[PDB]
Amino acid sequence: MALDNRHRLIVGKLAEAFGLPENVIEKTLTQDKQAVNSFFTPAGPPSLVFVYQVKEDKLKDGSVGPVDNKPTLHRIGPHERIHNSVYFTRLNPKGINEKTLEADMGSGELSVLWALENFKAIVSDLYLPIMQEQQQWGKMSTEYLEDFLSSTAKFGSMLTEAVADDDTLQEMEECLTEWCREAELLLNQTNKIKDGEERGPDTELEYWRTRMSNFNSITEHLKKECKLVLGICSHAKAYLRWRGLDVQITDAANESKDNVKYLATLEKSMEPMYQGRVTDITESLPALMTNVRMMYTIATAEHMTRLFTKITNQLVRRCKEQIMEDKVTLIGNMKVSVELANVYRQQYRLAKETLAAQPEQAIFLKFDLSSKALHKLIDMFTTIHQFSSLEQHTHIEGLDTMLKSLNNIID
Amino acid sequence: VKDIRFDYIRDRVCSCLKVPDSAYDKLVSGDGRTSLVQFMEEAHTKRLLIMLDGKDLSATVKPPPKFKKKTVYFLKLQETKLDNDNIKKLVIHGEISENPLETLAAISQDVFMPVLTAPANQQGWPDVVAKEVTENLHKFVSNVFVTIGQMKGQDKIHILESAIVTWTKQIKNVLKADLTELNFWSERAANLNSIHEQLTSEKTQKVVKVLELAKSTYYPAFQRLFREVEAAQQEANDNVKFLKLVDLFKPIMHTLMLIWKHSKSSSTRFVTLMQEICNDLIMQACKYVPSEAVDKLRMTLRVLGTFKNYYFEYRALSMQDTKFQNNSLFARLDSFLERCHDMMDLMSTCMQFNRL
């Protein structure tokens, strides 16, 4: 409830961090003391953030600074390139003077570098154990929190992805040729992604995400701006090429955005089969065809080829791995896997029946070779296990070397 | 040199721990400053915790539940502390508060929506990614709001997206919310009333009408889910108002028959399962009771049991005057009765063969 005591506590802490000892730190926290009272005790402000910019040394020395720059003891703690913050958001509904200031007001000390590193550090990296320790310390609310921190991880992924006259004629040639060639390159990303490998369908989503990130980077890079103004001056060599590339970039960007958001809708029902159990995919497949069937009521060859070949690649990967880690277990797993392939083909043929009703090369090749190399081996093990009941009646006087014939046949 | 980093971290620790003493030598002189120097001189080392228990310090990672603790986090952005370029501007110099979840809620709703707003205003993300970061920061807000407390007690389209996504999630939370029996139904009444005026309040009403400037599909679904809320709320209230050495306390059992007399003059399955709860209390008492006295105490035990089954048939006859439940009480109570008939007649044989 005491404005001045917490004012001088934040003066001392912002001096110990910043180096502005007494004069303008205390003057700026003193100035407009109605709001300084109206954050601490009263309603309205839930923090009073002193941000301090710099204009001469780019704040690199950090030991101390003049106040020629404009510091803002403003309500918002903004994230620009230039000002180091202190928020002192208070963890008390009413400002109580008796409670100390450094046990509820967290300091706002911020690296002068931009929005990549500090925020992912403060969200994902630093806070790893306490919730987990609180996971250890008695909660039922364990569910959906692990994937909540996987959402923090994908924040980290996307911020790492995204944040990372003769003289005039010379400048025009110097900044055009390079960037036009790069744009022409980036309009060929659909071609270097058709290759021979058992690849997984999430790499599709990641390829489209890289297309998004590079499109955003180039379109921001063009929006250096003096060279655009130089282009406007120099329309009276690349400007035919620039309007052509602009039309190409707009069409590519629009189809990329539509593809990314619709391919993003698919993820929560294709997700169980990447790492789960072999029987789970059987139940997942009706949901999977509800998703795919609704999405082809909208938008073709690239979707069909990449989606179906890679998803069937992943089914082969999961079945073959989950079998490889004896007899009754193996025969059971082969029965389960053949039933999985059968229900997949059955539901795709039902899908083709519906697709014909209302208004498959990869499947053929991949599951036909898998199912034939499973029928042969499942019949071999059924025969072996049917001959395996012989294996312990060794005292009958006519089953001694007979089993060694069976042993050679096995071996 | 390591000395500029050492004295910088020392002056920061004297700033943030605020205990004037030579205690820096009393704790750090063991594993402390060696762990600090190996933290600063090794690759991949990205975190450090220091806890201030009021006056005490601990350089660690594991947070204890001791009150008045304070948290400071140290991270070198670089793998070493560089002699050339200054280390005073350390990328992570964090001081925090005792309770973590309150701070995450406060940081979500106070200090880091600027990261959502102003970098969106400046370069980098004018695309669908701005809509994405707004929506899942709203998800952050909703989650940190609900998982605390509930455990313990062109513009038009995107604004519609936010103000419909938060109710998709909150309805998932609501449908999750639809003496074990007594406390179960008391909790159900209390929680469902509390959510029922979390849904009929002012700002929710304005949100429903602002959304009803679109009138597309979702709002009949929230109408039907409110229809789910109200009847269960009132009926839970009704049965909560209804629900409000054993040799000395058989007259209490008359009260029990009278409760069944008075209540049923609800639904049958919870009635039978309440009878199961009564029988598990009775088995609790009949283990609380425990070679010639043993027959006497088991005679008392069967005597209480036959008052119990006699009150059952009294309730049956008075029901006739004013069918599966017999089989259920038979299952539980008769399993017990034959456990201790076996042991009681075993001790009867044991006494008779103690006469040799």
Curated annotation (Swiss-Prot), chain A:
Coiled coil: 396-411
Subcellular location, record wording: Cell projection, Cilium, Flagellum; Cytoplasm, Cytoskeleton, Flagellum axoneme
Protein family membership: Belongs to the dynein heavy chain family.
Recorded domain comment: Dynein heavy chains probably consist of an N-terminal stem (which binds cargo and interacts with other dynein components), and the head or motor domain. The motor contains six tandemly-linked AAA domains in the head, which form a ring. A stalk-like structure (formed by two of the coiled coil domains) protrudes between AAA 4 and AAA 5 and terminates in a microtubule-binding site. A seventh domain may also contribute to this ring; it is not clear whether the N-terminus or the C-terminus forms this extra domain.
Purpose: Force generating protein of eukaryotic cilia and flagella. Produces force towards the minus ends of microtubules. Dynein has ATPase activity; the force-producing power stroke is thought to occur on release of ADP.
Assembly, per entry: Consists of at least 3 heavy chains (alpha, beta and gamma), 2 intermediate chains and 8 light chains.
Protein name as catalogued: Dynein gamma chain, flagellar outer arm
Residues of the full protein shown: 1 to 464 of 4485
